[PDB]
């Protein structure tokens, strides 16, 4: 549901290649994106299920 669920995915400054999930409000689903490993924003979930539970409906 919420308003952090509308923010674009944030890789951040660190240089890991960690695959996480963000809510894509355009698509109306959770998608994967590369998370650099630090300084995460709130639209960042470890599984699709977590993501759908928190955002799905935004």
């Amino acid at each position: 549901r919420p308003d952090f669920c509308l923010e674009p995915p944030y890789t951040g400054p660190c240089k890991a290649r960690i695959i996480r999930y963000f809510y894509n409000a355009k698509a109306g689903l959770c998608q994967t994106f590369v998370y650099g490993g630090c300084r995460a924003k709130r639209n960042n979930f470890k599984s699709a299920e977590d993501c759908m539970r928190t955002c799905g409906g935004a």
Binding site: P13, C14, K15, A16, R17, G36, C38, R39
Partner: protein, 223 residues
């Protein structure tokens, strides 16, 4: 690594891949059971892969060993990325051969203008995405503290340094974290962070390994 070249197979024998279903980070083999990497690469269920070139196919030179312990530095700050350093103890000791060798810890810190080798399987595009199969290498010099602090005001601590080219095009990138910066055979750095990759006036930032040696030796010896 943006702007690098293909190292050539097994020619960086102390480079490791950190695997969690896929390559997420790099690391350096420091002895037969110990790997050093970045704190921000901390995961559960790590597998370490040794003797890799093509991380996507099985070449017959590999050793896949799971981690028994992962020790993130007691003072790691996840906001400021200070003390971005972690040790990984393998479940069993690797076999050291020619394709799998460890890297010496430094005795002293490197100076500005030292040319180093940075290696990794991370993104090869500055803008865009291209992750390679084989290991990529880059010679990049150590930058001066003063220029590092100009590139990132208020963000460099005494445990960081900058390496690379203020003009851009050559850098480490997403995927590269935890991997080595090796200067004159000694492990000076750990690939850590930056403002994007291979951007002009924003060199990569690395953990200053030479500050940690004591901590590393004593942590290895009592675990």
């Amino acid at each position: 690594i943006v702007g690098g070249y293909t190292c050539g197979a097994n020619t960086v024998p102390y480079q490791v891949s950190l695997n969690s279903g896929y390559h997420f980070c790099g690391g350096s083999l420091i002895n037969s059971q110990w790997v050093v990497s970045a704190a921000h690469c901390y995961k559960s269920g790590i597998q370490v892969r040794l003797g890799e070139d093509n991380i996507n196919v099985v070449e017959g030179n590999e050793q896949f060993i799971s981690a028994s312990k992962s020790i993130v530095h007691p003072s790691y700050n996840s906001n400021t990325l200070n003390n971005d350093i972690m040790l990984i103890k393998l479940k069993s000791a690797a076999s050291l051969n020619s394709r799998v060798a460890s890297i010496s810890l430094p005795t002293s810190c490197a100076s500005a203008g030292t040319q180093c080798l940075i290696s990794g399987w991370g993104n090869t595009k500055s803008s865009g995405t291209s992750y390679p199969d084989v290991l990529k290498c880059l010679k990049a010099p150590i930058l001066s503290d003063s220029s590092c602090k100009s590139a990132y005001p208020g963000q460099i601590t005494s445990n960081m340094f900058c390496a690379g080219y203020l003009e851009g095009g050559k850098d480490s990138c997403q995927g590269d974290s935890g991997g080595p910066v090796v200067c004159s055979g000694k492990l000076q750095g750990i690939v850590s962070w930056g403002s994007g990759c291979a951007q002009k006036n924003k060199p990569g930032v690395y953990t200053k390994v030479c500050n940690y040696v004591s901590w590393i030796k004593q942590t290895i010896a009592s675990n």
